[PDB]
Amino acid sequence: SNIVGIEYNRVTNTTSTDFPGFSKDAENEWNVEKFKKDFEVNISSLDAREANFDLINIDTSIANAFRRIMISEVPSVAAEYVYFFNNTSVIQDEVLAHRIGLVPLKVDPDMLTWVDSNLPDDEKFTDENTIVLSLNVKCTRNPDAPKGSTDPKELYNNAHVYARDLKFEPQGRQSTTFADCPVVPADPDILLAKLRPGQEISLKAHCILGIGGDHAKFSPVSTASYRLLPQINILQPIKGESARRFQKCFPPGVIGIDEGSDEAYVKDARKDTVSREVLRYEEFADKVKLGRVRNHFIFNVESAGAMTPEEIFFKSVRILKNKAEYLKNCPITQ
């Protein structure tokens, strides 16, 4: 079977069993035509920052590879070096640099070139491989302030250094390439720092592109994950008040009661988060069986704002294909 059964104390049938050698029939040999016929993609939602889509009739290894590549192998642009001029804040320089490196930047990674590490620092950063962001905030006491006010936004002028203060400074040909798509943070309301009068922040951040495995600030996804499609089988009819109890073991939109026969039936198993409450009660034993479809993945890819989640998934598929091609083209050394 292909249904991961869910019991009250254990999870059964979790390993894929589609390969020759599993049975004497010697079936499930790799055929690209059968996979092309069986594989399906169903898009349920496609927003600017979130995509939800079902992959049907694909193996667990490939879906997990897609998830891992989206998390740690798809490049994105984040701040890497911070040069400080007169950081007078109570926030330390290391903490402020870390926070600036953690903001997401709305830069297409395809427009930047990878930075050669072995090159010296005098010629390491070019206009093709570095984006310079300037921050300059001074806090002054407000003269036209309310008499009895206590809000920091009225007693002071720049008491909150936000992410939108990271202005973009074009360098060289970036004045033309970045003309229609200026560099802005994806979340301009990020509270980078708080100030009081007499305090000043002035800094230049060099931003490069890297992969999420090196540092978590380069991951282009808020979260990239999948969950198998739940499956509830009502083996025997459940009628009457118990059916109402059978409705309370699940989220409200999962299982409904027919008006005519007054019996419970599954309405939307997608909403069914597996809390396995129904297995606690002895009255529903030998009446309900829970499982998950092993080859029905529901990907929910939430982007960090740099680029669209569908682009992230496409880049992950392309990265896996390029890894396979690179290993195929390499010679084998003894």
Partner: protein, 45 residues
């Protein structure tokens, strides 16, 4: 060159060779060195 801060009255002040270690606007005797003007580099990690 303005280089020092009084820890109480928070006023910029500088010390000569013969000047005592005390503020000029008040008698407070604790002075904090101000932040340098040199570039300091940090990695965002």
């Amino acid at each position: 060159t303005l280089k020092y801060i009084c820890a109480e009255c928070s006023s910029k002040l500088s010390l000569s060779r013969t000047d005592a270690v005390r503020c000029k606007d008040c008698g407070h005797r604790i002075l904090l060195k101000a932040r340098t003007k040199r570039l300091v580099q940090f990695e965002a990690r």
